[PDB]
Amino acid sequence: DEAVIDIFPTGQTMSFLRLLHGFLGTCRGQSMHQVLRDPCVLRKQLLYGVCKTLFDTITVRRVAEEWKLHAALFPYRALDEEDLEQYLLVWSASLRQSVQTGVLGALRDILYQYADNDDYGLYVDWCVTVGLVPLLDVKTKPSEAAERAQFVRAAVQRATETHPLAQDLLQANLALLLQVAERLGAVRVANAPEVRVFKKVRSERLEAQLRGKHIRLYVAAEPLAYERDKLLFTTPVAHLHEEILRYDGLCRHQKICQLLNTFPVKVVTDAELYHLPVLEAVRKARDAAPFRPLAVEDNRLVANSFFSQFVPGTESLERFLTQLWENEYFRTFRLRRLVTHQGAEEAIVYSNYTVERVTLPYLCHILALGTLDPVPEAYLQLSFGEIVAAAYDDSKFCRYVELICSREKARRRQMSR
Amino acid sequence: DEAVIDIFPTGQTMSFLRLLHGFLGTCRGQSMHQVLRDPCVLRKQLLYGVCKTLFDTITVRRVAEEWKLHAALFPYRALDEEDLEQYLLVWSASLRQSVQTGVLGALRDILYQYADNDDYGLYVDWCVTVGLVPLLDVKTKPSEAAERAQFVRAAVQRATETHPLAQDLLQANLALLLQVAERLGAVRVANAPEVRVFKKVRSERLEAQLRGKHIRLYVAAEPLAYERDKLLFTTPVAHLHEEILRYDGLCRHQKICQLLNTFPVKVVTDAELYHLPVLEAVRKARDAAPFRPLAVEDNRLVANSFFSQFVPGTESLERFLTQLWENEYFRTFRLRRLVTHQGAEEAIVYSNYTVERVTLPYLCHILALGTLDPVPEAYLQLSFGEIVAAAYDDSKFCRYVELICSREKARRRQMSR
Amino acid sequence: KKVRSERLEAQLRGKHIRLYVAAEPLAYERDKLLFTTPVAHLHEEILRYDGLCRHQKICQLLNTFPVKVVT
């Protein structure tokens, strides 16, 4: 039996998850954590990365080849003065919308089936409250890899009946598609009881076990460790644990100093009230708070007493704590505050440092990052389905259309002129 | 008998539905849940999805063929200088309004008959308060599928007497229309007494039963489960349950400390008031609140008493709770606040993230999502009937009118010039 | 609302009449059942207001005299 210092299921960190999802502590700052765990933004960045890796592959060759196919199939032309640019622009729009809705249906189906592990919304807690994530690599029989291969083959059959160039792109990159699909169902966030993580004092190679079985873990911020056997975390929630404990103690104190002043006089020695009228309400109230005196024996000597009536004010440290939570979650992740003119907090949303700090290291330890890339934060406010329309616009897919536009305008301009 | 931790019909979550529809708690924020369960926006997005799936199908061929039909039926033409564009524009407007009112009558009939299951308004409660929906897959005899076929055939007979191009669109896609009509009446939201959901501790495969019958359920957020046998949820309403319980405790406390200070003096030892004139009113008032003393025996020793007069201030935590509720429902769903200049809260309405978070997973577990798409949030504020006029305008149905406009202007411009 | 089959239907003086349900209330082992309608969202608060109005009238009608004595 090795003496090993333990960190996870103590009071100091089991209380952290209760306060962080609000069993004990509450404030207006509690919302600024729940903005940080939108599990849709992970699937947005995931689809942005897989579509950006998808689209920039064969932008040069097939834009000539399928245009040659549709041109030799239908070379119909009346005049080369006005209608050529109109056919050009409706051509570009039709291609981009067809491959758009094709890969949009493909990514939408393969994500809406099995991207809802929703472990992001716990990953942010273990990256904000202890700085290191427990996770159990769930594996199954290898037949289920063939089952997922079957499912993504059915999805690209939907793409096959959608459009030929889209299914050409998916038949190009389905290998990495099924790779990131299996990496997506590869792990959980260790959301299970009787889990524990500890730091062995002889060799600081702190590792978790789940119910006796060793599990791996990704450490992002190892705590500082000294001759203080208990050890301080550098995590952002542990910056403010004392203050929110002070707040909840003040809430209990205010409740008990309210509940001990209910009666009008002091001596020494359930909607029942609403509906029922006042003539019996004054009857029920008088027995609802029984007058109780208070007494201790003393010989030849009684009190010269004093009375104190106060309630502790919550609004001062309430405004202080909400300001503390607000400026804290704006420093340690640079959330933006986009507003209109004289506009009051229209949106709080992820910015460039936030995705770099939480989403990209997440995909580092899911190891999907070998193919992916960050989404710019201006794109993240957009839609689930509109994001691709600017995503492959950011690639040279729509930039090659301008060059083939100039090539076609030269090709028929030397015909006309 | 298996020891299974139970979650649904306890105090902690049956009280959630009572506070959410306001049996116990109240605030100015309580409306911000009821804006989130507008059941008309689901049928809005549903009709947008089915009209978008309809209208992009045959935009290329039949616009030429039916114009050939109308041209060979009536090729009358006086001059090609001014009147050609006028006939062209009234032609395009008549086409779009005819198919508009055709599919509008079709979707209006098939929606107003059997889309008022209104289960969205309960789905948002089980997605906001426990993060998972119980639901019972209601099935019937297979004859009723032929009754629904009969109903949609009657609706397309109304389309038949409306317009032929709309009847061609519905005769093209009536199969998937029957699919979405069946999937719409496929399930309820498990709004029934004696329903229960629990989490089996031996394998965390939490499942619901209805009165002993096993039913499936869609989990969107697995709650955190530990050696704490009770488990904490990550949902929005459980983030603020304690604070509104504090509010209701203060409401009861203020009601008592108002109801116990009603008499003017204290010693130690129903509209019947309004109509009645004051001479008998002051008579009924004194017996309406009888003077009562209060007494406990003591020997050789009496009181040195003190008096307290206060009621708790409700407006401080009332403003605090409404602000908490407000910024809570603004972070966890990015509800927009569209306003005019110096305009105060003109509308709170669904934005891009909100439909992605609640409507699209709803249609994911109704499995209508294989044919549908999100409506952009700017369209959802528009009408039930005007929405399609922009919806197929977003498609190439009105964009192909510009190309056949240029084709007709070339076809008669080479005739005139 | 019939508890055996939730097929809630109205009658007029013993004669059955039809009804259009726009929002069926939620029903549980709570025999009284909660409505999802907007007026039931604020019923408790306006009952609190009317109780306060009665309370203010009766605490006005009990302070009308200038002096108060005991005996």
Author numbering:
A (entry chain V), B (entry chain G): 52 to 320, 488 to 635
C (entry chain A): 250 to 320
Question: What does the report in the manuscript say about this coordinate set?
Answer:
Here we present high-resolution structures of the A- and B-capsids and in-situ portals of human cytomegalovirus. The portal proteins are believed to orchestrate nucleation of the procapsid through the formation of a portal–scaffold complex, which facilitates procapsid assembly. During the maturation process, the disassociated scaffold proteins are expelled as the viral DNA is pumped into the capsid through the portal located at a unique vertex of the icosahedral capsid. All three capsids possess a mature icosahedral shell and are distinguishable by the inner capsid material: (1) C-capsids are filled with viral DNA; (2) A-capsids appear empty and are assumed to be products of aborted viral genome packaging; and (3) B-capsids have a featureless inner core consisting of scaffold proteins, likely generated by an unsuccessful initiation of DNA packaging.
Notably, the C12 reconstruction of the B-capsid portal reveals that, among the cluttered scaffold densities surrounding the portal, 12 ordered density fragments tightly encircle the portal crown region. Each of the 12 ordered density fragments has comparable strength to that of the surrounding portal proteins and well matches a 15-residue-long loop-helix-loop motif. More importantly, each of the scaffold fragments is accommodated into a hydrophobic cavity formed by helices from the crown domains of two neighboring pUL104 molecules (helix 110–124 from one molecule and helices 110–124, 134–164, helix-loop-helix 205–225 from another one). Previous biochemical data indicated that tryptophan residues in the portal of HSV-1 are essential to this portal-scaffold interaction. Consistently, we identified two tryptophan residues (Trp118 and Trp142) in the portal that participate in the interaction with the scaffold, and noted that these residues are conserved among herpesviruses. The present study shows that the portal of the B-capsid makes extensive associations with a protruded region of the middle band of the scaffold, which comprises the scaffold domain and 12 loop-helix-loop scaffold fragments that insert into the pockets of the portal crown domain. A portal structural comparison of the DNA-free and DNA-filled capsids shows that the scaffold fragment binding cavity of the portal is closed off in the virion capsid, suggesting that dissociation of the scaffold fragments from the portal is necessary for the required portal conformational changes during DNA translocation. Meanwhile, disengagement of the bound scaffold fragments from the portal would, in turn, release the restraint on the portal to allow for further conformational changes that are required for DNA packaging to proceed.
